Symmetry: C2
């Protein structure tokens, strides 16, 4: 799996169904900005 540590949202991002992921993780997951992902408990 592609695994990451959870951090809180920036203030301007509060209230969005959005996750901010840097380009290296996006490349490992196989997604681009705008794509939909599942965020799943490990």
């Amino acid at each position: 799996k592609v695994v990451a540590r959870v951090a809180e949202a920036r203030a301007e991002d509060v209230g969005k169904r959005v996750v901010r992921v840097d380009k290296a993780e996006r490349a490992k997951v196989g997604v681009k900005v705008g794509d939909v992902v599942e965020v799943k408990k490990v």
Copy 2:
């Protein structure tokens, strides 16, 4: 599943194995800040 739209990282967050998730999504996923999650292609 708990599903979210992918957005790019803020500049200060580039190069981290971190995903920023707001409190509502953290509550739905069942995790707290510092927890490890999987980010999975849908």
